[PDB]
Design a binder for this molecule. Sequence first.
Ligand SMILES: C[N+](C)(C)CCO
Ligand SMILES: [Cl-]
Ligand code: NA
Length: 496
Amino acid sequence: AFHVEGLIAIIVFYLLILLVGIWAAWRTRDIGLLVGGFTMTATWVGGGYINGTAEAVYVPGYGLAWAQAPIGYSLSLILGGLFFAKPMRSKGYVTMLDPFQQIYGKRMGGLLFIPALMGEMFWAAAIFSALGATISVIIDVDMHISVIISALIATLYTLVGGLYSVAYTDVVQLFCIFVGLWISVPFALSHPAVADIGFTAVHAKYQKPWLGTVDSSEVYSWLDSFLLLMLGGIPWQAYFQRVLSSSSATYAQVLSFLAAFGCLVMAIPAILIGAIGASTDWNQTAYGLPDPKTTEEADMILPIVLQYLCPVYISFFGLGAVSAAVMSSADSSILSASSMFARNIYQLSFRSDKEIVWVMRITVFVFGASATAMALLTKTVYGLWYLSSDLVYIVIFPQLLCVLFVKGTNTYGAVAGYVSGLFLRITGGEPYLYLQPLIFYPGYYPDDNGIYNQKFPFKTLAMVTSFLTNICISYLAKYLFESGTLPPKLDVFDAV
Ligand SMILES: C[N+](C)(C)CCO
Ligand SMILES: [Cl-]
Ligand code: NA
């Protein structure tokens, strides 16, 4: 029943992506800055960007007003270029966890690896879910098998590309994403089922208007989420790997700015596809009634629009664009997680080149399997894409601010900030993971599923409490050990 045309199309597109990169690696006027910016854009923009942005715009509860992850994650690159690019450079940093291990120690750096590893896993699960949904809709494959196949192909791509040389694969992949999406959009807009997306943005005919709305009581919560996506999107090894490998600090800053511009440009057609899905009379298409959000297939809105509103070859171009985005992001995500585990955890704390290569291969496999299980269990792409930066914002970002800008931080403040931020984040609950809150801040309300949500900005409160606890406990421990109030024999971490 499945169309073999789709399988042959994804095969030929994958080969077309890899062959040009192999040729460019075989071969290899002030244009390298553009190439670096395009490569960073291809690293940043994956299945999360495209599919999660379309889902967030499509879902009536969110709209464009609540599709904050594309804008926030693009602004993360601008903020990184402005403030974090120079302090991370000119030091012997290979990974993002190197400042943490150099200032707080190996154990605290390994502890800080856990939020980063969980964020990488959430991002990989979101992009695996996006690719599996695209394959399942367009090639008509079972969703579980499609997700497993996507994870397998991403794993083999990362491994095969790793040992050999790849040059300018990301440029060609970004070109494929851009062309596929921007040729899919005009075909989707001209479908007889799709109504005027300008009218649907401000008026409701099929569902609530896709521009979205923010209530006056929700404003703080909106701001809270935006901060989580704008500041929690900065401390990632996929970005700092390109920052540290640059020739100069100015080159790193300019590639950050160009990458942010490219991310916004890539986010535009995803917003348009989500708006088209929100403006579609599904009773007129072959998808039929019920509509995708009634079917609980909202997270699959972008492939559905590609499949049921576009011709078959345009659907194949869109599938190629999604595949290019997912491969170019999954390579960086898997490699960053594996490199951080191999260098910071295995090589530095516990301990050979062959041994390191082998543990990094098996780590790629285990990370892929964990992300596959997470992708199979969940039902949302935007939710995992959002949650990837949640614990990063809560935990790593205050510690990153402390190690870069706050002179005098130590391990006691790091541990205190870790515990305080984690406690305030956990006690606030998580609706995506169906967790009840223990602390009930003012404005709490139950959703459809019965989990109490928080209108109070408790995530930003947890982050700020983590930062202030780090500073206060660090200076208090320094004062207590310097003045002689606390005996020096109790300095378990030997920080001061
Ligand atoms: C999820 N990240 C923040 C790592 C990349 C944005 O797509
Ligand atoms: Cl993404
Ligand atoms: Na990508």
